[PDB]
Design a protein around this ligand. Sequence first.
Ligand code: HEC
Length: 108
Amino acid sequence: TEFKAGSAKKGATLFKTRCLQCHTVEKGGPHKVGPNLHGIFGRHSGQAEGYSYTDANIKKNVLWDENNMSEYLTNPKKYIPGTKMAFGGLKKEKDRNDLITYLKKATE
Ligand code: HEC
């Protein structure tokens, strides 16, 4: 199906009230609870510096796409976390679309 993008243009504030709990997108920002996400799309599944998490499912030599990330940002946990905690849907569908886009443009 289509991916929609920059609709509410709240994504960057959604992040601040969703992801900021656990992560940053600042330039090599602090690995607060999970790692920083700077250029996470243009990286792979967790070639984060520093934060040597377990991330077996994550790794599976995977790339991060707006889709793949949106899925990881959609389902309430279940994505084999182990590590600790995943949360899923921000609150709405269009929010996820917004978020992914903003966090795309933020660092890709
Ligand atoms: C703390 C409760 C978290 C919240 C809220 C968010 N994330 Fe997260 N993320 C968290 C952990 C512990 C992990 C490792 C695997 C697991 O589910 O336990 C992750 C993983 C990611 C990843 C992939 C691997 C990485 O290098 O980080 C990404 C790309 C990611 N998380 C993004 C992300 C975003 C954008 C969030 C806000 C919507 C977000 N996470 C919330 C813990 C937590």
